Amino acid sequence: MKKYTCTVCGYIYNPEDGDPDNGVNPGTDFKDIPDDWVCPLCGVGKDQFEEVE
């Protein structure tokens, strides 16, 4: 699974770690994160994230 980066602040979503404190379990692909989730550091929405190739 690919990492995604917040293009506003630089936070990296790593699917191996998830974001469990906000209900995103380890192993969750970015696309499957509920679409009301926001960056845990700066608070912007999923639409400001981009796939890390």
Swiss-Prot record:
It comes from the Bacteria. Pfam families: Rubredoxin. Keywords: Electron transport, Formylation, Iron, Metal-binding, Transport. Binds 1 Fe(3+) ion per subunit. GO terms for biological process: alkane catabolic process. Rubredoxin is a small nonheme, iron protein lacking acid-labile sulfide. Its single Fe, chelated to 4 Cys, functions as an electron acceptor and may also stabilize the conformation of the molecule. Belongs to the rubredoxin family. This is Rubredoxin. It comes from Clostridium pasteurianum. The lineage of its organism: Bacteria, Bacillati, Bacillota, Clostridia, Eubacteriales.
